[PDB]
Enzyme design. Structure first.
Site, PDB file in Angstrom:
ATOM      1  CG  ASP A 194     -20.727  12.556  -7.838  1.00 17.26           C
ATOM      2  OD1 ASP A 194     -21.035  12.882  -6.669  1.00 17.26           O
ATOM      3  OD2 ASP A 194     -20.802  13.350  -8.806  1.00 17.26           O
ATOM      4  CG  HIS A 203     -24.004  14.876  -7.829  1.00 17.68           C
ATOM      5  ND1 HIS A 203     -22.969  14.929  -6.917  1.00 17.68           N
ATOM      6  CD2 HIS A 203     -24.709  16.020  -7.670  1.00 17.68           C
ATOM      7  CE1 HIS A 203     -23.047  16.061  -6.238  1.00 17.68           C
ATOM      8  NE2 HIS A 203     -24.092  16.742  -6.675  1.00 17.68           N
ATOM      9  CB  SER A 237     -23.691  18.707  -3.853  1.00 19.36           C
ATOM     10  OG  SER A 237     -22.936  18.979  -5.037  1.00 19.36           O
ATOM     11  CE1 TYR A 280     -26.400  21.922  -2.776  1.00 20.96           C
ATOM     12  CE2 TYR A 280     -26.844  24.263  -3.143  1.00 20.96           C
ATOM     13  CZ  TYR A 280     -26.330  23.058  -3.584  1.00 20.96           C
ATOM     14  OH  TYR A 280     -25.781  22.997  -4.846  1.00 20.96           O
TER      15      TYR A 280
HETATM   16  O1  LIG Z   1     -31.914   9.118   2.798  1.00 17.65           O
HETATM   17  C1  LIG Z   1     -32.587  10.200   3.446  1.00 17.65           C
HETATM   18  C2  LIG Z   1     -31.586  11.284   3.817  1.00 17.65           C
HETATM   19  C3  LIG Z   1     -31.474  11.414   5.371  1.00 17.65           C
HETATM   20  C4  LIG Z   1     -32.315  12.676   5.676  1.00 17.65           C
HETATM   21  C5  LIG Z   1     -32.437  13.511   4.398  1.00 17.65           C
HETATM   22  N1  LIG Z   1     -31.993  12.640   3.270  1.00 17.65           N
HETATM   23  C6  LIG Z   1     -31.961  13.010   1.943  1.00 17.65           C
HETATM   24  O2  LIG Z   1     -31.581  12.213   1.104  1.00 17.65           O
HETATM   25  C7  LIG Z   1     -32.385  14.406   1.496  1.00 17.65           C
HETATM   26  C8  LIG Z   1     -33.876  14.448   1.075  1.00 17.65           C
HETATM   27  C9  LIG Z   1     -33.817  14.380  -0.478  1.00 17.65           C
HETATM   28  C10 LIG Z   1     -32.523  15.193  -0.769  1.00 17.65           C
HETATM   29  N2  LIG Z   1     -31.585  14.861   0.339  1.00 17.65           N
HETATM   30  C11 LIG Z   1     -30.214  14.959   0.295  1.00 17.65           C
HETATM   31  O3  LIG Z   1     -29.541  14.652   1.281  1.00 17.65           O
HETATM   32  O4  LIG Z   1     -29.602  15.389  -0.834  1.00 17.65           O
HETATM   33  C12 LIG Z   1     -28.155  15.494  -0.909  1.00 17.65           C
HETATM   34  C13 LIG Z   1     -27.763  16.009  -2.265  1.00 17.65           C
HETATM   35  C14 LIG Z   1     -27.994  17.364  -2.597  1.00 17.65           C
HETATM   36  C15 LIG Z   1     -27.627  17.849  -3.868  1.00 17.65           C
HETATM   37  C16 LIG Z   1     -27.027  16.979  -4.804  1.00 17.65           C
HETATM   38  C17 LIG Z   1     -26.795  15.628  -4.470  1.00 17.65           C
HETATM   39  C18 LIG Z   1     -27.162  15.142  -3.198  1.00 17.65           C
END
Ligand SMILES: O=C[C@@H]1CCCN1C(=O)[C@@H]1CCCN1C(=O)OCc1ccccc1
Ligand SMILES: OC[C@H]1O[C@@](CO)(O[C@H]2O[C@H](CO)[C@@H](O)[C@H](O)[C@H]2O)[C@@H](O)[C@@H]1O
Length: 684
Positions: free
Chosen positions: A616, A651, A532, A452
């Site tokens: 979003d 989002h 994000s 991030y």
């Molecule tokens: O679908 C699984 C994907 C592929 C590997 C990590 N992934 C994730 O979705 C991970 C774990 C939970 C948060 N995450 C993520 O990518 O969050 C993105 C995000 C961050 C902040 C605001 C909105 C979206």
């Protein structure tokens, strides 16, 4: 592969006189038939591409089967009932249940019965002091906007008409008279993209129309702020109003509700530090702040003369970042030790009672409650450990298992190791690498590097059913605690802001180099992911080093760094990013890394799947639309540049389980397919 035709317009913007062309400017109009048609065309191409992947259905079924287990949260006591959330396994939204002594538990509020597709989600819940009325906020299709609904707690009957135009708002009751909430006037134009910069606190008195709500703060010029919040203390004695223009720093005011016509006193009148009220004991305020404390400290001050010159340390700043929770008459200081939690219990005089032993290295939740709660609950989890709930009796310090996880994952099957790699400038950055035991460091493991890096956000260990499935498929998941984050306090955060933002990207590139050098993976087996601000991270790294990875997964990313501040509440991120209007130096720096402006024709980009959602309003989807359009027009290599636009979602918060499963299945199928796998690496 045939991408939809994306026309190029004639728009040209100027920054301090320098011209910059924006051929896809028209995609910023989220309500035009042209933009809606482009989204349908892109989704069709993406679905057709994904449909050719033989194991996509298997991944989706594997995910759904492993997600299908009972989940339950900690109990909340209010009035004659104990409230708790539960999910039988695959319910789209968690269900709120309640139970009173001597009787069986019953469903109280089921969000799944509020929409035909599980896209309406429950956000804030706030009961009136007598426990007879419940005010709750709902999100529709996942946007940041909210409606506040009211219901009779005993009969469950809806009351009044829902309040509209609520956003970034808590719900705080003043006795049983009514409650405070925050709202932005409905913008003219699209509520999903129009700028909103004057947040206001209103008070809704029960039995009246919203149009008659009393304006409490934020209307007069002197009070204009992009973000405002109002909370009544537990004892109903004080009203605290916080006000900010960015995601870092805030003013704080306090009003003695015991005194009639009491004036608003200034706890902090500037935006040079973050300050929040942890709790109050009589007229003594307990404030958590980073004022003169990069790693934060807890101070006290009397509400009658609350200014910073009078704050006195209660828990002095240490080398580790501090967060404070309160409950059952105690203060719980949670410290971050290399991104993992440690908890210390203090009394309100600042005397250390004991350290609270945790089940291991990970993240904790809870330790929050009312002064009158006989017991507190806390949850523990990490990348290999599903959430486990524990009961904690503050006086004796007795810890007991409240609820073991029913997940089909065995913690002992995985490794989750922490390493500190060296970034370009020599800084050591934390990296937690997780995978199934038995892994060989032969450089062949399919790996997802996640980051991030910004906004003082700390990436602490968290359990994800999706991540656990990636590990079961034979993958490696690595999370970097990049600068810009809050893992090592304000200094760590500021080292990744404005004209130091490149440090964040350098930190991420170095994480990728470490994973390859140590043998976890190799270029053609590496994927990078972020959302994000993490979406910006992926967009910047793939445009700077398109040779570094095989797959790029930017989710709901900020990608047009020259115009991000012109949408919704985007200007609130100026503290971290700076804006193109700040100066020629800031404009040049932003243009220098802005993903949208650094895609170049003739370059061979890695396989990319840009993901966004049509509702979003946090980060407008136009960022993703314009970026994807540019990649499709400029990419000269054989790899696909796709965009997946989720419908009836925002989002991310409140996304129904069904959509989460489909998204993860698409992402993992695409990633393995682009890495050349003809079959899954392991049996699903
Ligand atoms: O679908 C699984 C994907 C592929 C590997 C990590 N992934 C994730 O979705 C991970 C774990 C939970 C948060 N995450 C993520 O990518 O969050 C993105 C995000 C961050 C902040 C605001 C909105 C979206
Ligand atoms: O890497 C070869 C392997 O890829 C598959 C599955 O994706 O097909 C791809 O490669 C073919 C050429 O070898 C292309 O014609 C096809 O469009 C592409 O998807 C397997 O069929 C092949 O064994």
């Amino acid at each position: 592969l045939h991408y939809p035709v994306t026309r190029q317009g004639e728009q040209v913007d100027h920054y301090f006189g320098q011209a910059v062309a924006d051929p896809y400017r028209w995609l910023e109009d989220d309500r035009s038939p042209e933009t809606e048609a482009w989204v349908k065309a892109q989704n069709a191409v993406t679905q057709d591409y994904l449909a050719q992947i033989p194991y996509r259905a298997a991944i989706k079924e594997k995910l759904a089967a492993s997600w299908n287990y009972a989940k339950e949260g900690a109990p909340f006591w209010w009035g004659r009932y104990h409230y708790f959330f539960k999910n039988d396994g695959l319910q789209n939204q968690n269900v709120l249940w309640r139970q009173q002594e001597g009787k069986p538990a019953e469903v109280f509020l089921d969000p799944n019965t509020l929409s035909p597709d599980g896209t309406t989600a429950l956000d804030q819940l706030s009961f009136s002091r007598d426990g007879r009325i419940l005010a709750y906020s709902l999100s529709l299709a996942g946007s940041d906007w909210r409606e506040i609904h009211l219901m009779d707690v005993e009969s469950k009957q809806p009351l009044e008409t829902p309040l509209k135009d609520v956003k970034f708002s808590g719900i705080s009751w003043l006795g049983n008279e009514g409650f405070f909430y925050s709202s932005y006037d409905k913008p003219d134009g699209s509520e999903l993209s129009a700028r909103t910069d004057q947040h206001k606190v209103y008070f809704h008195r029960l039995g009246t129309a919203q149009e008659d709500d009393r304006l409490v703060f934020g209307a007069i010029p002197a009070q204009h702020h992009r973000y405002v919040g109002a909370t009544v203390t537990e004892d109903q004695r004080f009203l605290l109003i916080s006000a900010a223009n960015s995601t870092s720093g805030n003013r704080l005011y306090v009003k003695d509700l015991s005194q009639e016509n009491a004036p608003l006193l200034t706890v902090q009148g500037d935006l040079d530090a973050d300050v929040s009220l942890v709790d109050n004991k009589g007229s003594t305020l307990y404030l958590l702040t980073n004022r003169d404390a990069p790693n934060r400290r807890l101070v006290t001050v009397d509400a009658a003369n609350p200014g910073p010159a009078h704050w006195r340390d209660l828990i002095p700043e240490r080398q580790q970042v501090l967060t404070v929770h309160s409950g059952s008459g105690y203060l719980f200081a949670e410290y971050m030790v290399d991104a993992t939690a440690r908890v210390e219990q203090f009394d309100y005089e600042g005397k250390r009672v004991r350290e609270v032993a945790l089940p291991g290295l990970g993240s904790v939740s809870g330790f929050n409650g009312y002064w009158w709660d006989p017991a507190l609950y806390f949850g523990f989890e990490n990348y290999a450990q599903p959430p486990t709930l524990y009961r904690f009796e503050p006086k004796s310090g007795a810890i007991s298992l409240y609820r073991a996880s029913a997940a089909p994952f065995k913690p002992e099957d995985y490794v989750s190791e922490q390493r500190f790699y060296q970034s370009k400038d020599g800084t050591r950055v934390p990296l937690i690498i997780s995978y199934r035991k038995g892994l060989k460091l032969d450089g062949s493991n399919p790996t997802i590097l996640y980051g991030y890096g910004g906004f003082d956000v700390s990436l602490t260990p968290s359990f994800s059913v999706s991540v656990a499935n990636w590990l079961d498929l034979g993958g490696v998941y690595a999370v970097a605690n990049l600068r810009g984050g809050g893992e090592y306090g304000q200094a760590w955060h500021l080292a990744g802001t404005q004209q130091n933002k490149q440090n964040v990207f350098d930190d991420f590139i170095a994480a990728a180099e470490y994973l390859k050098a140590e043998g976890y993976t190799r270029t053609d087996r590496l994927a990078i992911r972020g959302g994000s601000n993490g979406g910006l991270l992926v967009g910047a790294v793939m445009t700077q080093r398109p040779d570094l990875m095989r797959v790029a997964l930017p989710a709901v990313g900020v990608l047009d760094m020259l115009r991000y501040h012109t949408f919704t509440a985007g200007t609130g991120w100026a503290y971290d990013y700076g804006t193109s209007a700040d100066s020629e130096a800031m404009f040049d720096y932003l243009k220098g890394y802005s993903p949208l402006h650094n895609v170049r024709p003739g370059v061979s980009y890695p396989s990319t799947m840009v993901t966004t959602a049509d509702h979003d309003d946090r980060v407008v989807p136009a960022h993703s639309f314009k970026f994807a359009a540019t990649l499709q027009a400029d990419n000269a290599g054989p790899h696909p540049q796709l965009i997946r636009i989720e419908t009836n979602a925002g989002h991310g918060a409140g996304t129904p389980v069904a959509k989460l499963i489909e998204q993860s299945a698409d992402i993992y199928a695409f990633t393995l397919y682009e890495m050349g796998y003809r079959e899954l690496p392991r049996q699903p």
